[PDB]
Amino acid sequence: VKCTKARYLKKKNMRTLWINRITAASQEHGLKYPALIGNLVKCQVELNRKVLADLAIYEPKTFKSLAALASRRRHEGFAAALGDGKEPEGIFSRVVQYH
Amino acid sequence: GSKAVTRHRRVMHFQRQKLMAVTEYIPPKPAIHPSCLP
Amino acid sequence: AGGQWRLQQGLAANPSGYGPLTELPDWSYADGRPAPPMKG
Amino acid sequence: SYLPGYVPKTSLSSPPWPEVVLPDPVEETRHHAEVVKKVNEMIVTGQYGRLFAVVHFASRQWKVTSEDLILIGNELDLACGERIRLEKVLLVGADNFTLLGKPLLGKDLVRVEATVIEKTESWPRIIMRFRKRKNFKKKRIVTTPQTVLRINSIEIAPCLL
Amino acid sequence: FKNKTVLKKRCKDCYLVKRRGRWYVYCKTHPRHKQRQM
Amino acid sequence: KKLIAEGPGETVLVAEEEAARVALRKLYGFTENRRPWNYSKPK
Amino acid sequence: EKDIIKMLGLEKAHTPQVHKNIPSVNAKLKVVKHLIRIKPLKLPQGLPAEENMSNTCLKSTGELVVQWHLKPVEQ
Amino acid sequence: RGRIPGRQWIGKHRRPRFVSLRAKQNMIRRLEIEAENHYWLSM
Amino acid sequence: TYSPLPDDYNCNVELALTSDGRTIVCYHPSVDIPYEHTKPIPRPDHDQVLKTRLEEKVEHLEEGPMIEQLSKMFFTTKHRWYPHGRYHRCRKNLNPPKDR
Amino acid sequence: SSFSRAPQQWATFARIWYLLDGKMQPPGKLAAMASIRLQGLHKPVYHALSDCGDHVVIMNTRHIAFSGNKWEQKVYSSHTGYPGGFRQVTAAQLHLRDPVAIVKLAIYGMLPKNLHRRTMMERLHLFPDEYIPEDILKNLVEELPQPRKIPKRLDEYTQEEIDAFPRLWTPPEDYRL
Amino acid sequence: FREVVETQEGKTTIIEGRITATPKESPNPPNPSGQCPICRWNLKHKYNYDDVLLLSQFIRPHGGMLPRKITGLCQEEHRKIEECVKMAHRAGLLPNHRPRLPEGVVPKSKPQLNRYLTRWAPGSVKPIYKKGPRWNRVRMPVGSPLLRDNVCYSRTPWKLYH
Numbered sequence: 012v013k014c015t016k017a018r019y020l021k022k023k024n025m026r027t028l029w030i031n032r033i034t035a036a037s038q039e040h041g042l043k044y045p046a047l048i049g050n051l052v053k054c055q056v057e058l059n060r061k062v063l064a065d066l067a068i069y070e071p072k073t074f075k076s077l078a079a080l081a082s083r084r085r086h087e088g089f090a091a092a093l094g095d096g097k098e099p100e101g102i103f104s105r106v107v108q109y110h
Numbered sequence: 111g112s113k114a115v116t117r118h119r120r121v122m123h124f125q126r127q128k129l130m131a132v133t134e135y136i137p138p139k140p141a142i143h144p145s146c147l148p
Numbered sequence: 149a150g151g152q153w154r155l156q157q158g159l160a161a162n163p164s165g166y167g168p169l170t171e172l173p174d175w176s177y178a179d180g181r182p183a184p185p186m187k188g
Numbered sequence: 189s190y191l192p193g194y195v196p197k198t199s200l201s202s203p204p205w206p207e208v209v210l211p212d213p214v215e216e217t218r219h220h221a222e223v224v225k226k227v228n229e230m231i232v233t234g235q236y237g238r239l240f241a242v243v244h245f246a247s248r249q250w251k252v253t254s255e256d257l258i259l260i261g262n263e264l265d266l267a268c269g270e271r272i273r274l275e276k277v278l279l280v281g282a283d284n285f286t287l288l289g290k291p292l293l294g295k296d297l298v299r300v301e302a303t304v305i306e307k308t309e310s311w312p313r314i315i316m317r318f319r320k321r322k323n324f325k326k327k328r329i330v331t332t333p334q335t336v337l338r339i340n341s342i343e344i345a346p347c348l349l
Numbered sequence: 350f351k352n353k354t355v356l357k358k359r360c361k362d363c364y365l366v367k368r369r370g371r372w373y374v375y376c377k378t379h380p381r382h383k384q385r386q387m
Numbered sequence: 388k389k390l391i392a393e394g395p396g397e398t399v400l401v402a403e404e405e406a407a408r409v410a411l412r413k414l415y416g417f418t419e420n421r422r423p424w425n426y427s428k429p430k
Numbered sequence: 431e432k433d434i435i436k437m438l439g440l441e442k443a444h445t446p447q448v449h450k451n452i453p454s455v456n457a458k459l460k461v462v463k464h465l466i467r468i469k470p471l472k473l474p475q476g477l478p479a480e481e482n483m484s485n486t487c488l489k490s491t492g493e494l495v496v497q498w499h500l501k502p503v504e505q
Numbered sequence: 506r507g508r509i510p511g512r513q514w515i516g517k518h519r520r521p522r523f524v525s526l527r528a529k530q531n532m533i534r535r536l537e538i539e540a541e542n543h544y545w546l547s548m
Numbered sequence: 549t550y551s552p553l554p555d556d557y558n559c560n561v562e563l564a565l566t567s568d569g570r571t572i573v574c575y576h577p578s579v580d581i582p583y584e585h586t587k588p589i590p591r592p593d594h595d596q597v598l599k600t601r602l603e604e605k606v607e608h609l610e611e612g613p614m615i616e617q618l619s620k621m622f623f624t625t626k627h628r629w630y631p632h633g634r635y636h637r638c639r640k641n642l643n644p645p646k647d648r
Numbered sequence: 649s650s651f652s653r654a655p656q657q658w659a660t661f662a663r664i665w666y667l668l669d670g671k672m673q674p675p676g677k678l679a680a681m682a683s684i685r686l687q688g689l690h691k692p693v694y695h696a697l698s699d700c701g702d703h704v705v706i707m708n709t710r711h712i713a714f715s716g717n718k719w720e721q722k723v724y725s726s727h728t729g730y731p732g733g734f735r736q737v738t739a740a741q742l743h744l745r746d747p748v749a750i751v752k753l754a755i756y757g758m759l760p761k762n763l764h765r766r767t768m769m770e771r772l773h774l775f776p777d778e779y780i781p782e783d784i785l786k787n788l789v790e791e792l793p794q795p796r797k798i799p800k801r802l803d804e805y806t807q808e809e810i811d812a813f814p815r816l817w818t819p820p821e822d823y824r825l
Numbered sequence: 826f827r828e829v830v831e832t833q834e835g836k837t838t839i840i841e842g843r844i845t846a847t848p849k850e851s852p853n854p855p856n857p858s859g860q861c862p863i864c865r866w867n868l869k870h871k872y873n874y875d876d877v878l879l880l881s882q883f884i885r886p887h888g889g890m891l892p893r894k895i896t897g898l899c900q901e902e903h904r905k906i907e908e909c910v911k912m913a914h915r916a917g918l919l920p921n922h923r924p925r926l927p928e929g930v931v932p933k934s935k936p937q938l939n940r941y942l943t944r945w946a947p948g949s950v951k952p953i954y955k956k957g958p959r960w961n962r963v964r965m966p967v968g969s970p971l972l973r974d975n976v977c978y979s980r981t982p983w984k985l986y987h
């Protein structure tokens with residue numbers, strides 16, 4: 012019974028582990044976990060926790076590029092919140108449409 | 111249980127307690143305090 | 149994360165719902181032949 | 189020398205976070221083109237080594253490179269030895285440059301190929317339920333099919349510009 | 350003194366003063382008017 | 388004054404030996420980052 | 431309320447179902463209007479034709495598009 | 506110290522439950538949906 | 549002059565978009581440690597007649613004092629330095645699976 | 649990185665020594681950053697079963713600052729186990745008796761409630777004053793920034809900032825002040 | 826500002842009042858329509874206990890607060906400044922505005938305890954031996970409720986009770 016109910020904990024504890032490792036790699040670049048995940052989704056980048064944590068360990072130079080992108084999209088959001096719509100959208104704030 | 115009328119204030123159902131908290135008077139706030147204006 | 153933002157762009161709250169990522173085929177033959185449709 | 193919205197400097201006069209000024213989009217547009225021409229010139233000259241890619245396969249994202257294995261938890265209906273191409277590539281990166289899809293990369297820019305080497309069942313998994321004092325007990329065993337792929341090659345093409 | 354939950358002056362010479370975190374009533378004319386907040 | 392190799396170690400002598408090993412791999416081109424062997428059918 | 435949810439084919443949650451905007455149907459909806467999300471059906475291209483039944487897709491905006499090409503817009 | 510007489514969440518003397526901030530927002534989010542439901546059930 | 553992150557510690561990140569705006573290019577070459585930010589390795593560490601033969605310095609230490617010396621040099625507790633019984637010493641897999 | 653398998657493993661799981669200055673800093677904020685280092689939650693290779701913790705050195709623990717009236721209100725309670733052995737002292741009383749207990753008890757309460765916690769506390773080094781032994785001072789790597797920004801006294805402002813701030817009201821000339 | 830001096834010569838005491846140079850308000854205020862010095866400079870909800878340059882303009886040489894009919898403040902801001910000065914003295918931010926010590930007094934050496942955001946006077950505060958249960962916890966006040974409407978740049982509002 013424990014082994015059968017443990018298949019729900021394994022999936023939960025994995026995602027808990029990935030998030031803890033992403034949170035740590037984002038603070039090295041002056042970022043928080045919500046600002047990385049939320050702003051990578053805004054750039055149409057669909058990478059999950061498993062891959063991101065794997066990139067933080069084995070591809071550190073690619074993970075800083077993803078953090079710099081999230082910080083760029085985060086700063087564009089603030090700039091747009093200061094305007095009233097007149098100013099155009101940011102370069103990294105554009106969204107590709109699929110028909 | 112307890113009757114509908116009680117000498118003591120009766121504890122509400124949490125759904126009602128939440129409702130009473132959402133439906134609270136919110137007074138208007140002017141953009142500038144009237145005292146700061148002439 | 150991002151469910152409400154995706155809803156503002158005419159997308160699904162879950163990227164698994166619809167769009168290229170889920171609808172498109174996952175593989176094909178190296179020769180170039182297309183693969184049979186997936187069950188889902 | 190004071191404007192109508194001037195506030196003398198205090199702790200809460202201005203936000204704690206520093207002011208950020210983004211580049212001019214016009215001047216930035218031509219700076220982006222120079223970086224894409226540089227990376228594209230690194231692909232034509234083959235100035236890169238081993239490559240990794242993030243592919244979406246079977247509802248799942250795999251961080252793969254050459255001559256590596258991935259275990260799939262279902263049947264693919266392919267003979268052992270057949271060579272296929274993984275069509276969805278979210279990311280292909282090298283030591284000095286990285287390419288990202290939005291959300292998927294173009295097919296004329298990256299090509300990942302794999303090979304089927306084994307079609308086998310999983311080890312038996314115990315499914316058992318029990319409820320105390322209700323004479324409730326039942327056992328089940330299942331063996332899910334599996335398929336092992338070997339990533340053969342990950343090659344890119346100079347089609348950025 | 351005398352512990353009181355509702356302090357009150359009993360003559361013109363009583364004066365309120367906040368000390369040691371609580372309100373007191375002192376009176377030099379009639380020291381029996383002295384009260385401590387309870 | 389140009390970094391060609393850098394290696395870790397528990398002691399300063401082990402680290403100095405691994406750094407030399409790291410430089411030799413780069414000189415001969417047998418690094419880990421090197422591109423994989425091509426097994427594709429010859430054209 | 432459990433019975434009305436069965437009559438309207440709303441057993442499984444987060445599963446869009448289409449109904450007619452008429453008094454009798456609306457009446458059943460006024461009984462479970464706190465269990466559901468109502469949105470109008472939009473037809474930017476119009477009603478699906480016989481040659482489009484297998485090319486449709488219901489978006490989150492409420493629009494029914496009859497040409498699901500799954501390709502970036504060239505515009 | 507701090508005993509709740511009897512069982513916590515039943516009876517005359519219960520353990521007090523306080524409304525958090527997200528509990529308010531969660532209820533308001535539901536209301537905005539059902540308020541928009543009244544509009545589409547009106548034509 | 550704008551940079552999302554300081555390009556000093558790990559690499560030089562330069563983000564870019566394609567003409568169509570469907571791909572994000574990232575040029576990230578590694579930065580090298582300058583020569584001025586290092587230190588030189590410390591290479592440096594009579595009328596004798598009798599050759600100084602190697603003398604054994606294996607002094608006896610009881611279980612107690614020995615666990616205190618090990619827990620201080622490794623900054624641990626005394627508990628891991630105590631032995632275990634046969635039941636656990638025979639449960640350990642001596643031929644575990646090795647991945648790369 | 650093109651290293652050998654053994655050195656690559658030694659580097660990744662290496663222990664680093666960090667330095668913290670407790671002068672005019674609240675213990676909790678100090679303990680919040682010291683707790684993640686001791687567990688290794690600042691490493692992307694973190695796992696509980698991996699002894700991936702680091703060394704944290706906190707100096708000037710005698711000059712911490714509490715907010716509010718916590719020196720008087722806050723109480724640390726213990727029991728000797730014997731009848732009538734329940735003691736209750738304020739933070740001030742404890743601080744004068746042991747200038748490293750407050751910071752030590754805040755960190756010990758933030759670490760996980762398991763057997764590893766007493767091992768993480770051996771890798772924590774507290775010193776009341778700014779003096780540090782040579783051994784512990786020769787193996788330092790990085791100094792973590794203070795969380796709280798120490799405000800400046802009115803005697804620390806230069807004559808430029810004082811004259812830069814404008815005067816707001818015009819006092820009467822006939823006021824004794 | 827006015828000053829008073831006493832000079833004793835020949836067992837005769839003489840008392841005089843002499844005017845001194847007086848500071849003038851800076852010209853061109855941003856908001857000339859403001860009623861008190863605070864809104865005239867758009868500082869409402871934008872100062873804290875640590876803004877001593879602002880607080881020093883409203884206190885005396887010995888650390889005491891100035892009257893409201895002199896400064897011209899509104900009762901709402903005069904109470905805020907009066908409370909932020911209390912907390913600045915307690916945090917050690919006004920070391921040149923100390924109380925006057927009469928002749929023949931040497932303050933004793935007392936435990937130096939650093940503190941900030943001190944609402945209550947230390948000596949009039951008793952320890953919390955019984956914290957209480959989770960639903961009736963005895964909190965420790967941190968800050969002042971008079972500064973609750975101050976401009977917060979975070980999503981978490983000012984917490985006043987720990």
Ligand code: FES
Pocket residue numbers: 145146147859860861862863864865869898899902
């Ligand atoms: S702040 Fe405007 S009247 Fe005092």
Ligand SMILES: [K+]
Pocket residue numbers: 509510511512513514515516517518519520
């Ligand atoms: K009860």
Ligand SMILES: [Mg+2]
Pocket residue numbers: 111112113114
């Ligand atoms: Mg009843």
Ligand SMILES: [Mg+2]
Pocket residue numbers: 509510511512513
């Ligand atoms: Mg009970």
Ligand SMILES: [Zn+2]
Pocket residue numbers: 359360361362363375376378379382
């Ligand atoms: Zn009286």
